[PDB]
């Protein structure tokens, strides 16, 4: 009682009933499987972003004032 051994006959049709959907690309993918020494470092970089905030805020305020002076000169 020998059988049919293998096939792929109806399979393509089966696959395409529900698409063959491309893998859902999100923005912001994970950092799983990234070279550890990188991740250590970038973690540390994130950890101390809050240090040197006041300087950054002051710089942004100076930039905004320069923009306002430029728009007043234009108008």
């Amino acid at each position: 009682a020998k059988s049919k051994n293998h096939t792929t006959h109806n399979q393509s049709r089966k696959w395409h009933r529900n698409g063959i959907k491309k893998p859902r690309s999100q923005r912001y993918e994970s950092l799983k499987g990234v070279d550890p020494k990188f991740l250590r470092n970038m973690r540390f970089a994130k950890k101390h972003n809050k240090k040197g905030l006041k300087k950054m805020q002051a710089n942004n305020a100076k930039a905004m004032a320069a923009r306002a002076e430029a728009i007043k000169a234009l108008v």
Binding site: Q11, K14, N18, K21, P23, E29, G33, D35
Partner: protein, 159 residues
Amino acid sequence: TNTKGKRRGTRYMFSRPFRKHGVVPLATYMRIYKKGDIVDIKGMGTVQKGMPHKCYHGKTGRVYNVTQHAVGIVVNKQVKGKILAKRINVRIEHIKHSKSRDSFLKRVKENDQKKKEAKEKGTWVQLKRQPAPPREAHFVRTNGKEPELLEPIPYEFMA
């Protein structure tokens, strides 16, 4: 039934082309892959450490990791019904920059040039591409000489 061996059926794939065996020329090794660089994998027989699997030969993908002398690279692989974005670590020698993207970057750069200019002018320019249209009305001048008559030629058996 077939063997599941890793390198089965890569007699021709991983085989350096005719009169290009030997030393791997160094440019290969000394060009930089950042994150998010689109990259087309293509196995190479010489360098056997860090070879990608035969399925990803030909496939292109983006870089997500950069170790010392290898580069993690997300590629799409189909599997019967479902496509799986999956991440492989290939040693540099089996990898090139995919020029696919560069023609697009050139076109964006051209649009930005043509958007900065032609704004102060006022004349808005065609930015989108457009498919090769029907080839327009035009005259053909049979200058003096008439067209050449072409009889089909009579059969004869050569061999």
